[PDB]
């Protein structure tokens, strides 16, 4: 069951805490960790009402950050193997997609995209997906 | 993370399926599983004898529970199992007991009842109230 875990990162300090948390809670070994960022194509379209090739500059900001970061996440988990995916569309829409595509074993979402209020893109994947999913919050007391 | 998972059984459909699915989906080995069952304070109110009809439900519980004790252990590929039976509001007992046995994880079936989108509102409510991590299991792959 952590044979092939996928972990979507919006880049939140939220998203960043959840790797630490997991490292605190998990002592179990993980297979592979597909680490994913989807570029929010509706933020891009919230910049315009505000050429759509901030895109390429957007891929690189991601591509960069993400490979700058995939080593941290492999270890924070106890995963033998990490890969990275960039993606462009709606997050929960691209997540569910990736998980089916790569035949992932489980999906690990930080609870708060952004207490006890669940983020929206988590709530949605969480209903649109056939894979199982493990939400994580913060460390204990 | 599978060191002490907790796992509420609804005695429902959904509840036994979640157990196969974990059984098929999962191959790692759980430390201990506490197999909880909260017989719902609400539902009996349709109490339509006094307060010990409660407690014929209790052994009713330990009936299927304490015997489903030993096939869950076997699905989770658990080193150990146990049982707890509480009265109350399902999500609130779930969350109460999670926190109190300092469990590693809580595992829940998506739906107790048609289709992979009806979430379940016991689910949702544990989801929201807990600090613990949460596995929502649902149904298997291609084969």
Structure overview:
- The structure is a homodimer.
- By secondary structure, chain A is of the alpha/beta class.
- Helices cover 43% and strands 26% of the residues of chain A.
- The first copy, chain A, has a single domain, classed as Rossmann fold (3-Layer(aba) Sandwich).
- In chain A, strands 3-2-1-4-5 form a five-stranded parallel β-sheet, with helices on both faces.
- In chain A, helix 6 (120-128) links the parallel strand 4 and strand 5 (133-136).
- The A-B interface holds A 1-3, 25-28, 103, 105-106, 116-118, 126-138, 140 and B 1-3, 21, 25-28, 102, 104-105, 116-117, 119, 127-139, 141.
- It is classed as structural genomics, unknown function.
- Keywords: conserved hypothetical protein, putative universal protein A, Structural Genomics, nppsfa, National Project on Protein Structural and Functional Analyses, RIKEN Structural Genomics/Proteomics Initiative, rsgi, unknown function.
List its traits.
homodimer; 141 residues; alpha/beta; Rossmann fold; globular; Universal_stress_UspA (chain A); Rossmann-like_a/b/a_fold (chain A); UspA domain-containing protein (chain A)
């Amino acid at each position: 069951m952590f044979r092939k875990v996928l972990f979507p990162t919006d880049f939140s300090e939220g998203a960043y805490r959840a790797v630490e948390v997991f490292e605190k809670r998990n002592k179990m070994e993980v297979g592979e960790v597909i680490l994913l960022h989807v570029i929010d194509e509706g933020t891009l379209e919230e910049l315009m009402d505000g050429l759509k090739d901030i895109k390429e500059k957007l891929k690189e900001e991601a591509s960069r950050k993400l490979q700058e970061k995939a080593e941290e996440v492999k270890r924070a988990f106890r995963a033998k193997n990490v890969r990275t995916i960039i993606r462009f569309g709606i997050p929960w829409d691209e997540i569910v997609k990736v998980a089916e595509e790569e035949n992932v074993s489980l999906i690990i979402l930080p609870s708060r995209g952004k207490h006890e209020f669940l983020g929206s893109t988590v709530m949605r994947v969480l209903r649109k997906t056939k894979k199982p999913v493990l939400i994580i919050k913060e460390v204990d007391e």
